[PDB]
């Protein structure tokens, strides 16, 4: 019988190439615009992933939109963290197979602090030695971990799917090779990591919001990403969104 984890492995999108043009000198504006073009295409792939994620399309369409609009940066930063862990052990930001940013290439204006925060996310995978199946279950949980304070249109469906994936993360921990001796400690550590992602991504989001609204910086955004940010930004800045935390703050 096929398992839900086996399905998460099969539906995970292939890694995209950027098409970065190395012939021009790096500038913060050009690099950020290139990263946003790659990000918009990664978000398209993440939407197709969510459509294929078992249970997700049973949500009301407005809730599917809300969850993707609220969680997109968490999903992208978590996956960047994973690729940087697998490909460089957290030493370089592995945005794409043709766009790998090492510590020297990140000393451009504005870039350094944001890039260090993205490396911090990847360092958590190193510290915890996260398995691929644990990563896949946690990534689903990030899609399901930011909601309106006023609730969702299909709340009972949402509560059921979120509980299903919480159980799946448990299964991924139990199926790591070793014994059951450390399974509660592991679940505690990975849910502490999930809770920490809200803060770790929050600064990335504030930076993205500033580069989006301040047109004088000349950072380009592709169309679907601009639409998503335009909807997400006012809700986040007004304090109308809440993270679903596993632990007391």
């Amino acid at each position: 019988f096929p398992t839900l984890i086996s399905l998460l492995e099969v539906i995970e999108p292939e890694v995209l190439y950027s098409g970065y043009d190395s012939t021009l000198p790096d500038t913060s504006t050009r690099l950020m615009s290139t990263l946003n073009r790659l990000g918009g295409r990664q978000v398209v792939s993440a939407v197709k992933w969510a459509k294929a994620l078992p249970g997700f399309r049973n949500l009301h369409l407005d809730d599917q939109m809300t969850l993707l609009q609220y969680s997109w940066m968490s999903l992208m930063a978590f996956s960047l963290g994973w690729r940087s862990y697998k490909q460089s052990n957290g030493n370089m930001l592995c945005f794409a197979p043709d766009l790998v940013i090492n510590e020297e290439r990140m000393q451009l204006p504005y870039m350094y602090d944001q890039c260090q925060q993205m490396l911090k996310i990847s360092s958590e995978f190193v510290r915890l030695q996260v398995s691929y199946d644990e990563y896949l279950c946690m990534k689903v949980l990030l899609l399901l971990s930011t909601v309106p304070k006023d609730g969702l249109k299909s709340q009972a469906v949402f509560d059921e799917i979120r509980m299903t994936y919480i159980k799946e993360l448990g299964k991924a921990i139990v199926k790591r090779e070793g014994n059951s001796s450390q399974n509660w400690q592991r679940f505690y550590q990975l849910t502490k990591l999930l809770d920490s992602m809200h803060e770790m991504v929050g600064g990335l989001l504030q930076f993205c919001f500033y580069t989006f609204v301040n047109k004088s910086l000349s950072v380009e955004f592709p169309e679907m990403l601009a639409e998503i940010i335009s909807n997400q930004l006012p809700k986040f800045k007004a304090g109308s969104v809440k993270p679903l935390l596993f632990h007391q703050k």
Binding site: V47, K48, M65, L68, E223, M224, E227
Partner: peptide, 12 residues
Amino acid sequence: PSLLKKLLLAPA
């Protein structure tokens, strides 16, 4: 009418 809604509604 948003691009995200069109993609969510489109056949896979």
